[PDB]
């Protein structure tokens, strides 16, 4: 997160740090005690196998994510129509071996319902351990920042992303920059507060640089993916009934 601030305990109880080889790779968002929403490009081969991934929840600091605090990932499911070249359908689901324990520091974010009626420039928040500046290293402390939704028409402009924003993507940030997600925030939450409920409206996907002018963050439109998300958990719920 570039241009944001360090998160306090309980501020973003859904944010998880996904680890491979004892280091943070991507962010995720808890929706149920066993299901985390992340980005498909995080789990591209060779990280498509579940045994590579550990999820850390309720821990703000990377150096505090000790051996024994992590949750082993049991299943990884990339979106069936993911395109690694266009980042279209950049959504993936991770199932945990042991369900999370919910308290003030670990809680799920609500999946977006149809009829949200969000503002065209809705105030949003992005959190993650991503770089605090372009090409920087992972952030030790969890960071967060306010971003504004950017209408796809404007984001698809010729001086912004020139028709690269698909209906499976939403844009968030500031066309002047200085506040944006960055590498390491990918898969992390883009959430908004409405009706005193936090809604996961996007998952951090891609962008040209970090916090550069006229290059805002592009986020996977979770709203479009909810039908796929519901089908995956329901299908798992019936297999595991065995």
């Amino acid at each position: 997160i570039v241009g944001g601030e360090s998160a306090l305990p309980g501020a973003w109880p859904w944010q998880v740090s996904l680890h491979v080889q004892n280091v943070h790779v991507c962010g995720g968002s808890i929706i149920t005690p066993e299901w985390i929403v992340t980005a498909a490009h995080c789990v591209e081969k060779p990280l498509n196998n579940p045994w590579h991934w550990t999820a850390f929840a309720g821990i703000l600091r990377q150096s505090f994510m000790f051996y024994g605090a992590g949750y082993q990932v049991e299943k990884v499911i990339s979106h069936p129509n993911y395109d690694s070249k266009t980042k279209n359908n950049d959504i993936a689901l991770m199932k945990l071996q042991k369900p999370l324990t919910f308290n003030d520091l670990v809680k799920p974010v609500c999946l977006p319902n149809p009829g949200m009626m969000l503002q065209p420039e809705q105030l949003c928040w992005i959190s993650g351990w991503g770089a605090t500046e372009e090409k920087g290293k992972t952030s030790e402390v969890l960071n967060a920042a306010k971003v504004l939704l950017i209408e796809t028409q404007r984001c698809n402009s010729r001086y912004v992303y020139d028709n690269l924003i698909t209906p499976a993507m939403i844009c968030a940030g500031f066309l002047q920059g200085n506040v944006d997600s960055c590498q390491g925030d990918s898969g992390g939450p883009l959430v908004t507060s409405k009706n005193n409920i936090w809604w996961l409206i996007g998952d951090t996907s891609w962008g040209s640089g970090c916090a550069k002018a006229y290059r805002p963050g592009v986020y996977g439109n979770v709203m479009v993916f909810t039908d796929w998300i519901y089908r995956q958990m329901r299908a798992d719920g019936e297999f595991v009934e065995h």
């Binding site: 501020a11 109880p13 929706i31 149920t32 409920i197 519901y230 995956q232 329901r234 299908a235």
Partner: protein, 129 residues
């Protein structure tokens, strides 16, 4: 016509019989609408989603609706509220029926004047308000 994955007739979408090879026509028949979690069900005959009335709804019906949406045994709250979804047609419980989406029938009003608000999980809450 509605597609399964890349085509059926919308009267055979959410009709209680699996017609798609992957069952896509019968697994996405229940949804929550709006920031107030209005419980809605898809009507095959009307090719539209409609709110569920609070009339004769209980916790166990919600847990069934929660299971059909993929939330398994997760259930948080279910109360009757005024319909803010601008809908004109609703779905009423049978009570003599014997599936949650096929246990409702079309109705142009609700006797309780309320629709089901269904929260399958306690989410969306941080340290602040």
């Amino acid at each position: 016509g509605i597609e399964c994955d890349s085509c059926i007739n919308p009267s055979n979408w959410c009709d209680g019989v699996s017609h798609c090879p992957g069952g896509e026509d019968e697994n996405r028949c229940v949804r929550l609408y709006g920031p107030n979690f209005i419980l809605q069900v898809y009507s095959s005959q009307r090719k539209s989603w409609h709110p569920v009335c609070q009339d004769d709804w209980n916790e166990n019906y919600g847990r069934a609706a929660c299971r059909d949406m993929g939330y398994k045994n997760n259930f948080y709250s279910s109360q009757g509220i005024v319909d803010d979804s601008g809908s004109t047609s609703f779905m009423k419980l049978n009570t003599s029926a014997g599936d949650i989406y096929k246990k409702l029938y079309h109705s142009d009003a609700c006797s309780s004047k309320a629709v089901v608000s269904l929260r399958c999980i306690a989410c969306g809450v941080n340290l602040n308000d």
